[PDB]
Design an enzyme around this catalytic site. Structure first.
Site, PDB file in Angstrom:
ATOM      1  N   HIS A  10       0.835  -1.369  -0.246  1.00 33.34           N
ATOM      2  CA  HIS A  10      -0.198   0.094   0.096  1.00 33.34           C
ATOM      3  C   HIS A  10       0.956   1.275  -0.001  1.00 33.34           C
ATOM      4  O   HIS A  10      -0.005   2.495   0.087  1.00 33.34           O
ATOM      5  CB  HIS A  10      -1.040   0.084   1.236  1.00 33.34           C
ATOM      6  CG  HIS A  10      -2.000  -1.038   1.067  1.00 33.34           C
ATOM      7  ND1 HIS A  10      -3.097  -0.903   0.138  1.00 33.34           N
ATOM      8  CD2 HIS A  10      -2.313  -2.378   1.638  1.00 33.34           C
ATOM      9  CE1 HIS A  10      -3.688  -2.301  -0.084  1.00 33.34           C
ATOM     10  NE2 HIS A  10      -3.378  -3.067   1.066  1.00 33.34           N
ATOM     11  N   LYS A  31      -5.301  -8.751  -9.274  1.00 32.25           N
ATOM     12  CA  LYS A  31      -6.448  -8.386  -8.587  1.00 32.25           C
ATOM     13  C   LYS A  31      -7.227  -7.257  -9.260  1.00 32.25           C
ATOM     14  O   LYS A  31      -6.666  -6.316  -9.792  1.00 32.25           O
ATOM     15  CB  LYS A  31      -6.503  -8.386  -7.047  1.00 32.25           C
ATOM     16  CG  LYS A  31      -5.489  -7.223  -6.760  1.00 32.25           C
ATOM     17  CD  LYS A  31      -4.677  -7.061  -5.437  1.00 32.25           C
ATOM     18  CE  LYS A  31      -5.693  -7.907  -4.170  1.00 32.25           C
ATOM     19  NZ  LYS A  31      -6.775  -7.039  -3.856  1.00 32.25           N
ATOM     20  N   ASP A  32      -8.367  -7.159  -8.794  1.00 31.45           N
ATOM     21  CA  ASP A  32      -9.355  -6.137  -9.204  1.00 31.45           C
ATOM     22  C   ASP A  32      -9.037  -4.695  -8.813  1.00 31.45           C
ATOM     23  O   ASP A  32      -9.369  -3.788  -9.646  1.00 31.45           O
ATOM     24  CB  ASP A  32     -10.818  -6.381  -8.809  1.00 31.45           C
ATOM     25  CG  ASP A  32     -11.458  -7.689  -9.380  1.00 31.45           C
ATOM     26  OD1 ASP A  32     -10.961  -8.115 -10.500  1.00 31.45           O
ATOM     27  OD2 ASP A  32     -12.480  -8.459  -8.939  1.00 31.45           O
ATOM     28  N   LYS A  33      -8.540  -4.327  -7.843  1.00 32.18           N
ATOM     29  CA  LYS A  33      -8.412  -3.121  -7.205  1.00 32.18           C
ATOM     30  C   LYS A  33      -7.117  -3.136  -6.359  1.00 32.18           C
ATOM     31  O   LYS A  33      -7.382  -3.990  -5.517  1.00 32.18           O
ATOM     32  CB  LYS A  33      -9.508  -2.425  -6.594  1.00 32.18           C
ATOM     33  CG  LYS A  33      -9.528  -0.940  -6.215  1.00 32.18           C
ATOM     34  CD  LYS A  33     -10.733  -0.458  -5.544  1.00 32.18           C
ATOM     35  CE  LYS A  33     -10.595   1.082  -5.300  1.00 32.18           C
ATOM     36  NZ  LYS A  33     -11.458   1.799  -4.361  1.00 32.18           N
ATOM     37  N   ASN A  34      -6.397  -1.739  -6.294  1.00 32.12           N
ATOM     38  CA  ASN A  34      -5.621  -1.642  -4.904  1.00 32.12           C
ATOM     39  C   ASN A  34      -5.396  -0.472  -4.920  1.00 32.12           C
ATOM     40  O   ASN A  34      -5.170   0.543  -5.627  1.00 32.12           O
ATOM     41  CB  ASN A  34      -4.296  -2.280  -5.288  1.00 32.12           C
ATOM     42  CG  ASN A  34      -3.310  -2.490  -3.858  1.00 32.12           C
ATOM     43  OD1 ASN A  34      -3.844  -3.440  -2.902  1.00 32.12           O
ATOM     44  ND2 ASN A  34      -2.369  -1.727  -3.707  1.00 32.12           N
ATOM     45  N   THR A  35      -5.543   0.085  -3.597  1.00 34.04           N
ATOM     46  CA  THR A  35      -5.285   1.697  -3.137  1.00 34.04           C
ATOM     47  C   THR A  35      -3.924   1.828  -2.603  1.00 34.04           C
ATOM     48  O   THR A  35      -3.376   1.083  -1.661  1.00 34.04           O
ATOM     49  CB  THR A  35      -5.841   1.958  -2.015  1.00 34.04           C
ATOM     50  OG1 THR A  35      -7.435   1.951  -2.533  1.00 34.04           O
ATOM     51  CG2 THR A  35      -6.037   3.495  -1.721  1.00 34.04           C
ATOM     52  N   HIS A  97      -3.231  -4.294   8.153  1.00 38.66           N
ATOM     53  CA  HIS A  97      -4.080  -4.159   6.994  1.00 38.66           C
ATOM     54  C   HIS A  97      -4.651  -2.993   6.531  1.00 38.66           C
ATOM     55  O   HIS A  97      -4.758  -2.036   7.419  1.00 38.66           O
ATOM     56  CB  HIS A  97      -5.165  -5.213   7.239  1.00 38.66           C
ATOM     57  CG  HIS A  97      -4.758  -6.560   7.405  1.00 38.66           C
ATOM     58  ND1 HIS A  97      -4.383  -7.093   6.322  1.00 38.66           N
ATOM     59  CD2 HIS A  97      -4.552  -7.300   8.563  1.00 38.66           C
ATOM     60  CE1 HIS A  97      -4.230  -8.642   6.787  1.00 38.66           C
ATOM     61  NE2 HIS A  97      -4.209  -8.465   8.050  1.00 38.66           N
TER      62      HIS A  97
END
Length: 104
Positions: A10, A31-35, A97
């Site tokens: 992150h 994967k679909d998204k990550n910030t 997390h």
């Protein structure tokens, strides 16, 4: 699960994250998204100062956010930049997390 993994997943040292490159590596496996949070690690670690047992905490400050969001084409992304607060799970004074953007 731990501070080192949280940073790897992150924290970014550029706003202009190369989504198509980074998202296709094994860490993110398309994967679909990550910030990603554009920040040196220390003000991010500071979010959790004093918090010992696992707890979700929304940031007091706004941060510069760079999201890699998947398009209709597998493993091809759009980079969306925004400014917002975000929620992390703090444990033993460190983010372990990423919970979500804007709210816990």
């Amino acid at each position: 699960q731990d501070w080192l993994t949280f940073q790897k997943k992150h924290i970014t040292n550029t706003r202009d994250v190369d989504c198509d490159n980074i998202m296709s590596t094994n860490l993110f496996h398309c994967k679909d998204k990550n910030t990603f949070i554009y920040s040196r690690p220390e003000p991010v670690k500071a979010i959790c100062k004093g918090i010992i047992a696992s707890k979700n905490v929304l940031t007091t400050s706004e941060f510069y956010l760079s999201d890699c969001n998947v398009t209709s084409r597998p493993c091809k992304y759009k980079l969306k930049k925004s400014t917002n607060k975000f929620c992390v799970t703090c444990e033993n004074q460190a983010p372990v997390h990423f919970v979500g953007v804007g709210s816990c």
